[PDB]
Amino acid sequence: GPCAGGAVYSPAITDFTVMVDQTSHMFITGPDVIKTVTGEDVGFEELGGARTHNSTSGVAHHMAGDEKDAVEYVKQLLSYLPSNNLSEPPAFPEEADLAVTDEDAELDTIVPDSANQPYDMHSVIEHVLDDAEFFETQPLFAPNILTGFGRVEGRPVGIVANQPMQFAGCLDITASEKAARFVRTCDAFNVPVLTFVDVPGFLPGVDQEHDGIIRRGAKLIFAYAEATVPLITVITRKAFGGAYLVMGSKHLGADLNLAWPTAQIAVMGAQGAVNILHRRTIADAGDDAEATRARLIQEYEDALLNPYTAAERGYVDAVIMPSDTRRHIVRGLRQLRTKRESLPPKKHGNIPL
């Protein structure tokens, strides 16, 4: 329907908002006002219609075509959650058959040869889950990161992933907030969180660093470090700089951190490492300057743009053959499921706002 004025700050507090295209609107201040204040002329639909809340504001979770749908989505959301934060999320335990299917194998390919070629993370998700079922939240908002729910062995699990297809899978103010308050939701409800890692860094610009990335990118780091509930990570491809740390790293407390052979885990991309390291061996003899530099780049990428350093020092439990992932996450979230961990006494934290 309409949710107008202060009202809107009820549904805001609430975990998950569902809104139905073309027949539901939210707004703190009506178009009338904002005309005779700000001379700007705007319709209700654009101001606060479903799509506009879903894609732009980052306020709503879902935009269903009709009410019937919307109601069905709400029943889907309940399915994954416990009745209250004293029980663990409703299960229908199955025991999964962990012989290596022909679905499993497909993982072993679906990272292209070219670093640049994208590949849909939606696959890598649906590979691992029960019945390949992924129940995605906030699809229209920050596509560069993917959040939602499914099941592993009949037990609920929460999913956060970088989506190469969009922005290369680079984290941005919007993705960091969408992911941050998904994790916190899963954590408070005791639902476990499974994180898929492709991330070349944070998407540069001046805007981003005016708006306040600093504060609003932090959110995600806080959420991971706060979380008790089982945290399993898997690095498929790219994991550079802070944006490695952010994405459910071990340093924040993630239980089990896997990395595929393709994984690249390194302070910063090799051109923008080779630069800073070799800035007096690429200065000597401007003759054949690049010929060297794109050498020292092609040694950096062969020496350090791989999992194996972070393995040697136990930052990723295991480097694993992508096929194997739905075994590890199985026989991980078996052990975990009696994780017992807590954060110092305190009325509340102080997470960046």
Partner: protein, 168 residues
Amino acid sequence: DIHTTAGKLADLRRRIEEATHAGSARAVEKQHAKGKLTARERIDLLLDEGSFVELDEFARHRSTNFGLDANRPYGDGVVTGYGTVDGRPVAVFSQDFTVFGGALGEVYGQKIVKVMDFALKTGCPVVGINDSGGARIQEGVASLGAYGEIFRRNTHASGVIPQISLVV
């Protein structure tokens, strides 16, 4: 074939082979000749067939004292991870006598923290298989500091989650 996804899968089959066979093929023959089993062969006979999930299998030391950085075996002379004994969870380390005489070092200490801290966390037994010459002397005080951080988390556990030492 290296710069290629397939090549980088067929790399990590190579280093799995090298990691599981860390110890040299006279050192394993010496171990058998002494009527002993090898740390992996120990881990199998403990854990329910197929459970094993090995952690820090591609660990490597970071000591360049006394030319100990001539060889950095994967695993760093201990086999660690998690599985099931009789269909109940249990975390296990198995010291590898083949590797550096099985002498404790920094890394191969900090692996047997990771297992401990994973047991304490989950609430599951730790079964410690012991077979070592002693401290890795090359790494000096470092390999004492590792012992200490074990002996703090043997006390912290004590009475919480069963700790069984199998001295072999």
